[PDB]
């Protein structure tokens, strides 16, 4: 006969959804830089886990959420204690600058309520909408953008836009499962899973269209989708090198302060040096054209017996049908319709993009909470890596494949894709002849070879909040395991047997082939049907009677 | 001889003020609605604590100010992200509308900083207050009320008045006793107490004079106070029977929108459609006429060789003289003073209320804090059950009861008059012969019969810092449990015998008396005042000696 | 042969850093009071600490940088929910009044958006800018100081300025080090070291230059400092006795309230009465010599072969170069270069301070959070005890010691010299010879005799916030010695015996000389080396030995 034997540090874990701590490298101010959170591990401590297929699936990862939610509330603290420019949406009287830039003169106010003075500031013609009448050759009424629907808050001077890396350690109890398989795509089995205590570092880059300086892939050409059928779905290209990408805005412009109230500082652009050229973007044209053909090719093998046609944006507003791009705080809207002009046919010196600026922006889709961007003095130039792009399939012999982009949390999958956050279930119950490494890198071995880990495991046993809440919650955990090891009589113990038997039923396998050929994951798999009867069973009874027994 | 023994699990409490946990049932945005916390437990769990009268004093419970608080909170949270009206306060020339509406013109301010627009709005005469002379047939000028204290926050017409059930289950540590004896009052021992998860839900009905939409009584009619010599408290009365009473409006407005900032807008009344009908409400005059009746009849009783006359509100401004009621967002203040116009001789077809209606308010008789409703369009018919008076006895053959109100807290005493809180104390102290169901449903039993429930029993063991402090106390409680049974030598057990003698003093009954007749609540209240000197006496020099010398 | 024991409740400590809980005595609503934290222990249960000789270093406490924040969240706390004075900051047109006030005009704004009112408040020269030009004999235009950086926010009249004592009590798992040794500067041993629950209350109170209603020697003068070769740290000198102070404003104000906006108003200073007199300060003038010919003295015994000269302070504005005092909220500017005008020769009727008198101010050289002062009605008379002094040497003969201050840390300083904290570490190893009082009052005790306090000690085990990272990271801590204590098969005991051998090496002292003269702060700086490898060697291999065992 077998009796219930309680193991506790089981490398067993289930699917779950949970706050995390980030963590960056050590040393700042800027805007994504992360006070809130804790220095970063040196080493990760990666351990492959052998004879381990974890079921990816990137699409319903919760670290997306997280991180989204994460950048905005960055996003809001660097911007909330400066300037609301209150003061400004007022009218303004243009006349061409001696058609993409505008003198406007107006009055705002004075340091003094009692005051108004006569200034002046350049704006860009997408951030000024036309009153009465435009007359082409003449001064007319105009108003800032978004002051129908909320006062911008000017950018803080003291800090710049840095997409510093962001390190989510999973929390304790929680661990994170990392897909290392080449050639993965968002959703299904990975066969080289390995557990970390921080993931890579993930870059807050602010794009759409193209995603800039992310990861890439090291074998081929990735195509990453819920579906491909279903035509709503935003497809994530990745690509196994990147291209080139040159992006400047040739001119120079000076800085103004105008004094609009105590203290608060509006900064204006003025006094344009030189002729008024406009800003652009380069992209070498071969790598280019083969990063497309390679691209057109492995969606042709995903759709098979069809010709791929890159044609433009299916059309909308500036903020959509452009690639929105943050150079050193300046705010670029190019227009890539040359560059998705290709057909690809199963059967068989650089690109120069032109690009808009503005300075009023309505930064993650958000309605009211409109940013205004001071004219940033200096050379202006950023280069960056493209590594994958965001297409969406139009819904015939030929299928039609348009820039995307909208909803930032797609391009933070093209880096969380690899990662899942699981829950550890360390407590374990199994059959045993008596009646009476680190992390979690012994998942897939046999039960009786995971005898060792079993003390190993679970010594890791508004954001601010966000974080007691998490840690507290990890606290009761653990204290509700103790409790209920105390309870059956077992607390001190990592490994307790008891009197309960095991009479079949539960499991119809022998103490050796257990022991022998079976897993916790499939053991725990194959149990948690009866889980809690059979800690009903173990619970109370056996403790009542044997401390009533001894008592008397 | 009998020997000190310590049982944790003990069926033992006192009474104590804490943060409780709401919860809501599932699915929202509207005012009062709890985004804040937990979903309900669908079975609250209810058990019958037999042979245990726990003396219940409603006036004296936390869970009042609780709720009070809870509700400022949802108040404040629903109306502080919208619109402050800072454009509003501004002179208004009013002219009679083609006396309690006028047409009141204003310029307010417009989107923009520079201009301003002459605008119109019709406001109810209870909120404009008059500047220099009101002229009968002229325009005159007036200021909006609360000018002179504080610029009333527009209701955010994204949300509405709805008053959600809100259940307050017990945090752990903590159980909440429900009183179901019937024809109970507010105070005194009660002989049908239960222990539930969860009470019945409340809702945060806002109501003067008459309490509305609340629980009635299954016996007859209740009268609760603190005392009814005392002629300064409020008498609750509760009815074994509602009286339906239904409220209208009986006109048609038009919404109108004045922007006044960027975002912000103004909601204006105007366009009135058809004739001017005053405000009202219908309560059926047979059924009031009996309701008054009994309550008259009952206080008899409670006031004898006494003739009760129900006459009018002792005087006083509009908010505490009338009748508060919130109909969809509408505020009405109905005049009651033909309702309460009665006399009850110990010895022996609907009324038409006239209501007035007020668009700005001072909830919660806060200062500084007003609020500005918006109307709002429709049929506007409510109606409700009435199911409490509250009335107060003025300071002679005749005793003058006059509907009362000003203080909310009341109307929650209504329907939390059933409940206490209490902190369960776990760990308790018995002499034995040796040397060395769920919740509360054990108490009232003997000594011995309670050995069961000692395992089950301790299983259990702005708003989110205070969700926070709770639960991080009910940790530290149970640890500091914990840390004492280790030091005694008897952590992971339930029960443990020790060495040290109960020579009597402590306590002068026998084993099988104390085991037989006695209960945990007695041989704790016997035993209290001797717990802390046991503790001492068994902590550290039995523990200590064991120690030492098993190790030497 | 001997092997490990492993001690819990070990009385050894090292340096922290840690929040701590503040308290004050029972009893309000005025700056500076501690409605943010629990009522103190009537009995701060301090014990002296025997044999034991902690080394103090007052410039390293992390206690100064604590109340430095909680002085400023408290003081912003209070100015915080009132008047922000942004109706001013408008032109004023100031006339001689009937050359340090100023009748200065202005019309601000009134109650109603559409109108302005001509009002006139009495400023002092101090605080309003000039305009254009000043006109000796006529009107000139001014400003308000800090309308050029901030508005100031206008201290709330429902508070006064009191400063409370403030009691740290150390937190759970924590405890403070009081040094009671005479003599003792700020850096070095002290041979009389106590451990309390509390310290002595701190006075938050704000001066420069002068040491306020504080602490003083029961010795000699003593001066503290970093080091005095280094001419940049400041020096604290301290009496022992105090010098009387008594600062007056002899003359009457009457409080005016201007209406600005609705509710909030401006409380104005006018219609003097009588001649306007000069604010000033006493202090005896053979009290003052006696306590700088005694300075001079104890800092020549510091600086031998120098002539000590007290001359003036170097130079600067305003705040720095004056003595800051706050008398019931009304803030002076003393002129304290009378009193430090003396040569101290190493061979060998009261004094009138004139004194300026403002009421913005910019507390805590913050630049943007200014504070407006309202007038105080009244005889406006305080006096205080000077205790110590604020030093500065120059960068030859005669040594220059100027007054200085400017950072308000250094008079926290003056109060917390005495104090330290630090981190209990319960858990401690040592050989026997088997294989298998309150708070730290037993340090300096030997190893053998430290046997009893093991299980007294360890059973301790934005301001809210804070207090729960505190309260969360001591329970962590205390769950993390339990559950390292269960895995070495530990958990429930105090003191345990296990089957590893002491091989030397760790340690080269036998049993008898270790539990005879070695205490548990010797012994753990000694096996401070080894610890982790000691830990690592028990931990696992034991427990999983004998459970394995144990099962087959
Ligand atoms: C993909 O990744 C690339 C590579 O990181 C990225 O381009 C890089 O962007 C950063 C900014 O995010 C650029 O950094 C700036 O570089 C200029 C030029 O540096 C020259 O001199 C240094 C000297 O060491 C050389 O090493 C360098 O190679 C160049 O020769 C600097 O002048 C910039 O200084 C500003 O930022 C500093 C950060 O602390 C400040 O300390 C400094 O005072 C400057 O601040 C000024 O501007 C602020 C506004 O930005 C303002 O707030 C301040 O008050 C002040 O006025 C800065 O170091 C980097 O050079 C880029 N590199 C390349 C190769 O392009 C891409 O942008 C990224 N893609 C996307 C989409 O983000
Ligand atoms: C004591 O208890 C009674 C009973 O609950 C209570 O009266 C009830 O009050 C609620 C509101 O609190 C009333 O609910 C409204 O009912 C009208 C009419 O509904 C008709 O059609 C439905 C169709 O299913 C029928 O079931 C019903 O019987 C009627 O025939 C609705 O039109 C109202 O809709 C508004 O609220 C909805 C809530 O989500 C919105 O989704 C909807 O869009 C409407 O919102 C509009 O008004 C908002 C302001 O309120 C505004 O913010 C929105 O933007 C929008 O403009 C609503 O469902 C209910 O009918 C009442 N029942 C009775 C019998 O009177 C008493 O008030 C209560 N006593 C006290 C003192 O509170
Ligand atoms: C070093 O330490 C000394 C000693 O503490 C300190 O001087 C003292 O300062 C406090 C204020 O911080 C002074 O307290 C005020 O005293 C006057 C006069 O009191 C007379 O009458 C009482 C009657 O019991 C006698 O005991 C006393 O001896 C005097 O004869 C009071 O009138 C003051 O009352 C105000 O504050 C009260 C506090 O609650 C209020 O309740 C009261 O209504 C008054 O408030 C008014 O002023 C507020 C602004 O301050 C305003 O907000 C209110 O609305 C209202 O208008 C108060 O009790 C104490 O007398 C001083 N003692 C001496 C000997 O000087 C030094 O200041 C300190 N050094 C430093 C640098 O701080
Ligand atoms: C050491 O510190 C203590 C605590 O401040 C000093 O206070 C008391 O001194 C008397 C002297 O007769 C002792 O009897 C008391 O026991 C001391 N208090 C306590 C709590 O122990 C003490 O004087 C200091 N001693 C020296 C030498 O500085
Ligand atoms: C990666 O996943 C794919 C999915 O089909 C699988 O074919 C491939 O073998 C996996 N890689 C490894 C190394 O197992
Ligand atoms: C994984 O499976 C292989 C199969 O041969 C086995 O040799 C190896 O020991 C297993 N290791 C673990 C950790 O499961
Ligand atoms: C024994 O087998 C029966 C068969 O259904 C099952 O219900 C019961 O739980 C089993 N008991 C144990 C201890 O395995
Ligand atoms: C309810 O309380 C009253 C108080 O006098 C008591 O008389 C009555 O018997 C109680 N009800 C029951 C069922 O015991
Ligand atoms: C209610 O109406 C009656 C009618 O005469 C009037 O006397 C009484 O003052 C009114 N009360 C209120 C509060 O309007
Ligand atoms: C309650 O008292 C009655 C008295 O007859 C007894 O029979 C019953 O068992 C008791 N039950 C409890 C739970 O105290
Ligand atoms: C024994 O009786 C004495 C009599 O007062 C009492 O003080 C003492 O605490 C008792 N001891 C025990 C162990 O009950
Ligand atoms: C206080 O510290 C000084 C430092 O030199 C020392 O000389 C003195 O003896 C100490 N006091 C006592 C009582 O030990
Ligand atoms: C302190 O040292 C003295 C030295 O004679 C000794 O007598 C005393 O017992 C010691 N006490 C402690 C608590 O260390
Ligand atoms: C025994 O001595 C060696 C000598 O270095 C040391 O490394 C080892 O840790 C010691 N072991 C124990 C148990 O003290």
């Given at each position: 006969?077998?009796?219930?034997?309680?193991?506790?540090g089981?490398?067993?874990?289930?699917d779950?959804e949970?706050?995390?701590?980030?963590?960056?490298?050590?040393?700042?101010?800027?805007?994504?830089?992360?006070?809130?959170?804790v220095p970063?591990?040196?080493?990760?401590?990666?351990?492959?886990?052998?004879?381990?297929?974890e079921?990816?699936?990137?699409?319903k990862?919760?670290?997306?959420?997280?991180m989204?939610?994460?950048v905005?509330?960055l996003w809001?603290?660097?911007?909330?204690?400066?300037?609301?420019?209150?003061?400004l949406?007022?009218t303004?009287?243009?006349?061409?600058?001696?058609?993409?830039i505008?003198?406007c003169?107006?009055?705002?106010?004075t340091?003094?309520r009692?005051?108004?003075?006569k200034?002046?500031?350049?704006?860009?013609?997408?951030?000024?909408?036309?009153?009465?009448?435009?007359?082409?050759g003449?001064?007319?009424?105009?108003?800032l953008?978004?002051?129908?629907?909320?006062a911008?808050?000017?950018?803080?001077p003291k800090?710049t836009?840095?997409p510093?890396?962001?390190?989510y350690?999973?929390?304790?109890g929680?661990?994170?499962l990392?897909?290392?398989?080449?050639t993965?795509?968002?959703?299904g089995?990975?066969?080289?899973?390995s557990?970390?205590?921080?993931?890579?570092?993930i870059?807050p880059?602010?794009?759409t269209?193209?995603?800039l300086?992310?990861?890439?892939?090291?074998?081929?050409?990735?195509?990453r989708?819920?579906?491909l059928?279903?035509?709503?779905?935003?497809?994530?290209?990745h690509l196994?090198?990147?291209?080139?990408?040159?992006?400047?805005?040739?001119?120079?412009?000076?800085?103004?302060?105008?004094?609009?109230?105590?203290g608060?500082?509006?900064?204006?652009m003025?006094?344009?040096?030189?002729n008024?050229?406009?800003?652009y973007c380069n992209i070498?044209?071969d790598?280019?054209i083969?990063?497309?053909?390679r691209?057109?090719?492995?969606?042709?093998?995903?759709?098979?017996?069809r010709?791929?046609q890159?044609t433009?944006?299916?059309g909308?507003?500036?903020?959509?049908?452009?690639?929105?791009?943050?150079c050193?705080?300046?705010?670029?809207?190019?227009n890539?319709?040359?560059?998705?002009?290709?057909?690809?046919?199963?059967?068989?010196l650089?690109?120069?993009?032109?690009?808009?600026?503005?300075?009023?922006?309505?930064?993650?889709?958000?309605?009211?909470?409109?940013?205004?961007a001071?004219?940033?003095?200096?050379?202006?130039t950023?280069?960056?890596?493209?590594?994958?792009?965001?297409?969406?399939?139009?819904?015939?012999?030929?299928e039609?494949?348009?820039?995307?982009?909208g909803?930032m949390?797609?391009?933070?999958?093209?880096?969380?894709?690899?990662?899942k956050?699981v829950?550890?279930?360390?407590?374990?119950?199994?059959p045993?002849?008596?009646?009476r490494?680190?992390?979690?890198?012994?998942?897939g071995?046999?039960?009786?070879?995971?005898?060792?880990?079993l003390?190993?495991?679970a010594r890791?046993?508004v954001?601010?909040?966000?974080?007691?809440?998490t840690r507290?919650?990890?606290?009761e955990?653990?204290?509700?395991?103790?409790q209920?090891?105390?309870?059956?009589?077992?607390?001190?113990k990592?490994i307790?047997?008891?009197?309960?038997?095991?009479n079949?039923?539960?499991?119809?396998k022998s103490?050796?082939?257990?022991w022998g050929?079976?897993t916790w994951?499939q053991?725990?798999?194959?149990?948690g049907?009866?889980?809690?009867?059979?800690?009903r069973?173990?619970?109370?009874?056996?403790?009542?009677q044997?401390?009533?027994?001894?008592?008397?």
């Amino acid at each position: 006969n077998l009796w219930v034997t309680v193991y506790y540090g089981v490398p067993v874990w289930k699917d779950a959804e949970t706050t995390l701590f980030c963590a960056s490298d050590a040393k700042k101010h800027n805007v994504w830089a992360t006070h809130a959170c804790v220095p970063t591990d040196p080493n990760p401590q990666e351990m492959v886990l052998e004879n381990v297929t974890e079921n990816f699936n990137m699409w319903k990862n919760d670290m997306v959420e997280q991180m989204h939610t994460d950048v905005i509330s960055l996003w809001d603290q660097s911007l909330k204690p400066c300037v609301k420019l209150t003061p400004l949406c007022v009218t303004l009287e243009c006349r061409q600058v001696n058609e993409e830039i505008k003198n406007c003169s107006f009055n705002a106010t004075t340091e003094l309520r009692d005051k108004k003075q006569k200034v002046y500031a350049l704006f860009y013609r997408l951030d000024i909408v036309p009153l009465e009448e435009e007359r082409k050759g003449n001064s007319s009424k105009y108003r800032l953008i978004n002051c129908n629907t909320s006062a911008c808050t000017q950018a803080c001077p003291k800090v710049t836009f840095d997409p510093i890396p962001i390190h989510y350690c999973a929390p304790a109890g929680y661990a994170i499962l990392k897909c290392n398989n080449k050639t993965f795509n968002g959703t299904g089995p990975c066969n080289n899973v390995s557990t970390v205590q921080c993931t890579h570092g993930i870059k807050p880059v602010v794009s759409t269209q193209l995603l800039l300086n992310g990861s890439l892939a090291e074998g081929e050409i990735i195509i990453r989708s819920e579906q491909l059928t279903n035509n709503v779905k935003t497809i994530i290209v990745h690509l196994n090198e990147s291209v080139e990408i040159v992006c400047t805005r040739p001119n120079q412009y000076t800085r103004k302060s105008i004094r609009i109230g105590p203290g608060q500082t509006f900064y204006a652009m003025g006094d344009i040096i030189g002729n008024i050229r406009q800003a652009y973007c380069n992209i070498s044209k071969d790598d280019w054209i083969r990063t497309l053909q390679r691209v057109g090719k492995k969606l042709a093998e995903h759709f098979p017996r069809r010709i791929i046609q890159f044609t433009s944006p299916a059309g909308g507003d500036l903020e959509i049908t452009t690639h929105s791009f943050n150079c050193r705080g300046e705010f670029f809207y190019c227009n890539t319709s040359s560059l998705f002009n290709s057909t690809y046919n199963p059967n068989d010196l650089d690109i120069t993009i032109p690009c808009r600026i503005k300075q009023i922006i309505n930064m993650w889709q958000r309605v009211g909470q409109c940013m205004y961007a001071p004219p940033i003095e200096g050379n202006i130039t950023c280069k960056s890596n493209i590594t994958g792009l965001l297409l969406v399939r139009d819904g015939q012999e030929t299928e039609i494949f348009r820039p995307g982009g909208g909803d930032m949390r797609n391009n933070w999958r093209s880096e969380l894709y690899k990662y899942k956050v699981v829950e550890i279930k360390p407590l374990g119950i199994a059959p045993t002849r008596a009646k009476r490494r680190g992390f979690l890198g012994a998942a897939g071995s046999t039960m009786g070879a995971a005898s060792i880990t079993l003390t190993v495991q679970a010594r890791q046993l508004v954001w601010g909040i966000k974080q007691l809440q998490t840690r507290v919650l990890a606290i009761e955990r653990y204290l509700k395991d103790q409790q209920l090891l105390g309870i059956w009589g077992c607390s001190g113990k990592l490994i307790c047997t008891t009197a309960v038997p095991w009479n079949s039923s539960w499991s119809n396998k022998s103490h050796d082939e257990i022991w022998g050929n079976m897993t916790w994951m499939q053991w725990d798999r194959e149990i948690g049907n009866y889980t809690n009867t059979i800690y009903r069973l173990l619970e109370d009874s056996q403790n009542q009677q044997e401390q009533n027994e001894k008592d008397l």
